[PDB]
Write a protein that binds this ligand. Structure first.
Ligand code: NA
Ligand code: NA
Ligand code: NA
Ligand code: NA
Ligand code: NA
Ligand code: NA
Ligand code: NA
Ligand code: NA
Ligand code: NA
Lengths: 318, 317, 316, 318
C-alpha cells in the first residue's frame, strides 16, 4: 500500500483520516495532531455531521482504523523537528493550514518522504483538481488540492466547456458555514455574508484557458456542511435544457465517473451530507435563456467531496 | 386622509398596519383579523424581527396606532358578509392569501370600497410594482402588488435595461424563510431549490423583459433579509464602475426611496426593517467579458414590500 | 407476525414505519396517509434528520420495506370509511393527531382490528409508558403511549423514587422544535410553555404525579431534547450513589429503555437513539444531603417510536 | 465626570462603550483596541444584535460618541507600554480576557489610574455583583464584575433567600451562544452541557449561599438572550403567589433597575438589549410541596452585564 501521513486534525484532517482508512491500497502510517491521543480518538469516533466511526487503540498505543491498523500518533508543532520519514511515510497530506505555501510545506521533504499534498490553496504551488487537470501532473514534489469550492466548480466548467465552449461564466457559491474584509470582523451569527473569493485566479490554476473568462463570489449562509454552486454560463454553441442535461449526465458516466453525479430525485441539501462527489448536479433546475445561456446548480459536502479527492490525488501521484 | 382597511393579520398584514399607521395622509379605518382583539394587540406590539411598537385599545375597543386613532376591529372570515363599507373604507389591502384572484377579491367592492390591492400575485389581476410600472395604472379597481421577490428584481432589471439593454438575465433569489416534493421536506436547516415563475412574474410588469429572463429561488433558514443575485448579459458594454454608476444614479432620481445602495459593506441583519425594495451591494458588483454583470441586492421580505403596498395605496387614491 | 397498520405519516408515523419494518415479528399490512403514494415513498426513503432508508414499490403498488413486504397504501381522511380490517390488521398505531381521545380512536375497532395505540396523550384514554407501568395492561382496546417528554422523565422518576424516595421534583424539558407565546415565531426564540407535567406523570405513576411539576423551554434545535430533573429525596444522596442507581437500572429493569452516556457526548450524537432517555453521567450532581440534578437526552421521535412498537409487540 | 478607559473591543468592550457613552456622569477618555481606527468605528456603529449606533470621527482622530466627545484611540497589546494615564483615565474597564487575574490586571495601576474593573471572573480578585454585594466594596483597586450568568442568578438568590431562606438550590443556565472534551466539538447546532463552577461563583458574592447551591449550563445555539432556571428548597413555606410577590416587591425597591418582571408573556427575542440583570418570567413561577419553587429569568448575555459594569464604575468612583 501507499504509505501516507496526515498532518493536522482539524475538520479536513479528520475527514481525510476517515476516507483514507477505507482505501485498500492506502496505509496511514502516521497522524500528527495538537490533540492528546485520547482526544484524537474521540474526535475520529464522534462527529457532529458525519456520525459515528469505528476506531481503536492498539496495546502499543498506535491507532487501528479500517485498513490502517498501525497508525503512529505524533504531537510535534515544529515542522523542522517532525520526522515522518521515521514512520516510512511516502505522501504527506498537509492539513494544518500553517504551511500553505511551496516554501513552507517543502520542509516536509526529508529523507525518505516523497511528496506533499496541501489540503488548501497554497502560494506558488502547482495546483491540481482530480478530474480536471490531474493528468497534467509531472512529478512535482509539492502540490495543492485547491479548495472545496474549486473542486465543485472546475469539473462543471470543464464538462460544459468541452460540450458547448464557455465564452463567459459567473459563479455564486452558497457556502454553508455552520461547521466551518470588514464583513469578517462581525460575528457570523445567522447572517448572510457576501465575500469575494478570487474565483478567476482559482479557476486559472486548473483551467488556465477558462480562468480569464469566469468570475464570481460567495454568499456565506448558516447551514451545515452542504454547499451549492450556482453557475451562470454564456456559450458559443446554442443550448437547451435537454442538451445541457445530456452533456452533464454523459460526463458522469464517462470522464467524470466518481467525481460528478446527477440528482434526479429532487432532494434537498441535508440529503447530500457525507457525499463523496465533488459536485451533484441539480437536474430538475437546469435552465437555459436565449440561445446561448444556462444556469447549472450543484451540491457538495464542503468536507467529504474534497477529502475523497484529496485521497484520490494521493493514490494518483503515487 | 385616505381611508384604508387591512384584511388579514399574518406577517404582511401586521407590517402593513405598522407602515400605514405612520403615514399622516392615511387613516386605517378597519382591520379584519382571525385573532382575538387582545392577541391582535399583542402581535402588533411585539415582533420577534421588527421589535416593539406602540399601540393601545381605546375605551370602546377600537385600536389606536399612530395616525390611525380609531381602528375598527372585525373578525369575519366570509368576504360576502364582511363590510368594510360600514367604516367608510375606500381601499382594501388584501393580505389573507384566501382571495388572490380578480374574481375573489372583487367581492370587496361595495358602497364606499372602490379599490383593492392584493398583497400577493393574483390570477387574472392587473399587477403593479411601484417604480417599475405603477404610472401605467389606469384606475383599475383590483390590482396586485406582485411578490417581495419581484419588487426587488424588477426595479434592478428596469434600471439596467435602460442603461445597457438587457439581452438575457438569470435571477437567483436567496429567500430567507425562518419567518413540489421539496416542500414536503420539513425545511429544518435545509437549503431548498424552488422554481418560482420568474419569467411570468417579470412579464406582468416589464412585458418586453419577461421573456428574456428566468431563474429560481434557494430557500435558506435565515430570517427576513433575502438577496437577489442577477446575472445579466447586455447589448452595450459594461464595467463594474459603469454598472455601479447607473445604479447609484437611479437611486438619486427615478428610483429614489425604492432602490438604495450599500457602500458600507454591511451584512444581512443590518437591513432588517429596511424600507427599500432593494439595497444594491455596491462592492460586490462585478463584470466579465464586455457584456456580462452580476448584481446583488438585499431586501427585507416583509418591510420593503409593505412600504410599497402603502405607497401604492397613496398613489392609486 | 403481529399485523399492524400505521395511521398518519407525519414525523411520528414515518418513524414508526421505519422502526416496525425492522422487527421480524411485526408485519406492517397497511399505511394510511394524506400524501400521494410517490410522495409517501419519498418521505420514507429520505429524512433530513434520520438519513436514507431502503424502500421499494411493488408492481401492484404496495410498499416493500424490510420485513414488511406487501404494505397496502390508503388515503382516507374519514375514520369511519377507513378500513384496516381489509389487510387483516390487528393493531393500529394512530399517529394523525386528529383522534387523540378514547371516543375518537374507538372508530378504528372493526373485524381483525382489536387494539389502537395512540401516539400522543389522549383524553379519557388508559395511558402507558414502557418500563414504567406497561405491566399494568389488562387487555384495554384503546391506549395512549403518552408523549416523548413523559417517556423520558417517567423512567427516571421511577428509578430514583425506588432508590431514594422522591419527596418532590421539578422538571424542565428543553424541547428541540426545528397560550399567546404560540402565536410568536418559533424559530428565533426560546419559548417557555406549561405542559401539565404533574397530570401526565399521575397517569403512569399515580403516587408520584402530585409530588412533581415542571415546564418546557422550546429551543430551535433538531430532534434531540433534554430533560432536567431537580429532585428532593427522603433518603440521602451523592453523585456517586445517584450514578450507581441509574447505572444499575440500565442493566436490569430498564434495559433497552434507559441508557447512560459515559463518553461526554453532545446532543447530535444521540440523533436516532432508540432509548427513551440517555442519562448524562458526568453532569449528575447533588447539593445538601437530599437534592439531585439529573439530565438525560432523547431523540423526540426515535425513542418514542421504538417504544410505540415495543408496546405493540407487548399488548399483542 | 468620571474618566474611564476601555481595554479591549470584543463584544463586551463594544457594549461597554455604547452603555458608557449614554451615561451623563461618565467620560470615556480612551479605548484600546486590536482593530484599526476605521474598523473600530464600523464595529461601534453596526451591530448584528443591538442595531445601529451614532458615532463619529473628529478631525484630530479621536472618537465622538454620546457624552464622550474626545475619545483617544490606542492600539497597544503590551500592558506595560499602554499608558491610559496620558488620557487622564481614572477607571479601567478591562475587557480583553488576557489579564483576568489580580496580578495581571494590577499592571494597569500606573500614575493617575485609580481603579480597574475586570469584565470577567478573575483569579484572586475581589468580586462584586451590583445589587448583591457592591455595598461591601471597600476601596479595592482591582475588582471583578463576575459573569453574566452570576449577574442574573445572584440577585434572584438574594431576593428569595431574604424572603424565604434558601436551604438549597439547583441552577441551570440556558446559555445562548449565537479540560472539557465537549469544547473540542465545534458548537455547531448542538446542545452542550457544561460544568460552570456555580457554587464557587455564588460563594464569591453570597458567601453564606454558595455552599448551598450548585448547577450547570446548557449551551444552546440562539443569539444573546439567555435564561436561568432556579429550583429552590426553602425553610419557609411558599406559594406561587408569595414567590411572585417577593420578586415583584424587590423590583420596586432594593433591586430597582437590576431585576424586572415580565407579566406580558413575552419570548426570548423580546428581551434583546434589555438593561436588566434578570427579567423574571412571572407566569411560569411554580411551587411544589410546601417548600419548593422554580423561578425562570431572561437576560441579554451582553447588555445586562454591560449596564452593571458601568453601574459598578460609577459606584466605585464615589
Ligand atoms: Na377574510
Ligand atoms: Na423609471
Ligand atoms: Na449602507
Ligand atoms: Na422587495
Ligand atoms: Na426539587
Ligand atoms: Na463564573
Ligand atoms: Na441599575
Ligand atoms: Na445578567
Ligand atoms: Na443603570
Amino acid at each position: 500500500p501507499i504509505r501516507i501521513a496526515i498532518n493536522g486534525t482539524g475538520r479536513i484532517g479528520l475527514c481525510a483520516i476517515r476516507v483514507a482508512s477505507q482505501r485498500k491500497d492506502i496505509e496511514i502510517v502516521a497522524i500528527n495532531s495538537t490533540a492528546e491521543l485520547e482526544t484524537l480518538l474521540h474526535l475520529i469516533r464522534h462527529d457532529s455531521v458525519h456520525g459515528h466511526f469505528e476506531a481503536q487503540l492498539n496495546a502499543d498505543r498506535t491507532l487501528n482504523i479500517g485498513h490502517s491498523k498501525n497508525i503512529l500518533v505524533l504531537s510535534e508543532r515544529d515542522i523542522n523537528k517532525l520526522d515522518f520519514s521515521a514512520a516510512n511515510a511516502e505522501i504527506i497530506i498537509e492539513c494544518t493550514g500553517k504551511f500553505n505555501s511551496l516554501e513552507a510545506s517543502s520542509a516536509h521533504l526529508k529523507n525518505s518522504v516523497k511528496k506533499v499534498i496541501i489540503s488548501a490553496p497554497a502560494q506558488n504551488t502547482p495546483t491540481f483538481v482530480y478530474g480536471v487537470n490531474h493528468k497534467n501532473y509531472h512529478n512535482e514534489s509539492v502540490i495543492s488540492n485547491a479548495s472545496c469550492t474549486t473542486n465543485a466548480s472546475a469539473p462543471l466548467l470543464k464538462i460544459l466547456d468541452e460540450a458547448f465552449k464557455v465564452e463567459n461564466a459567473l459563479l455564486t457559491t452558497i457556502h454553508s458555514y455552520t461547521n466551518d474584509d470588514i464583513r469578517r470582523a462581525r460575528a457570523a451569527g445567522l447572517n448572510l455574508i457576501p465575500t469575494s473569493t478570487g474565483v478567476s485566479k482559482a479557476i486559472s490554476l486548473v483551467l488556465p484557458h477558462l480562468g480569464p473568462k469566469v468570475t464570481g463570489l460567495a454568499i456565506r449562509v448558516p447551514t451545515p456542511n452542504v454547499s451549492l454552486v450556482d453557475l451562470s454560463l454564456n456559450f458559443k454553441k446554442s443550448v437547451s435544457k435537454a442538451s445541457v442535461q445530456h452533456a452533464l449526465k454523459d460526463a458522469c458516466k464517462h470522464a467524470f465517473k466518481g467525481v460528478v453525479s446527477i440528482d434526479e430525485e429532487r432532494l434537498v441539501s441535508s440529503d447530500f451530507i457525507s457525499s463523496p462527489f465533488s459536485a451533484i448536479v441539480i437536474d430538475d433546475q437546469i435552465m437555459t435563456i436565449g440561445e446561448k445561456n444556462a444556469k447549472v446548480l450543484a451540491w457538495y459536502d464542503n468536507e467529504m467531496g474534497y477529502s475523497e479527492r484529496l485521497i484520490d490525488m494521493a493514490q494518483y501521484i503515487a
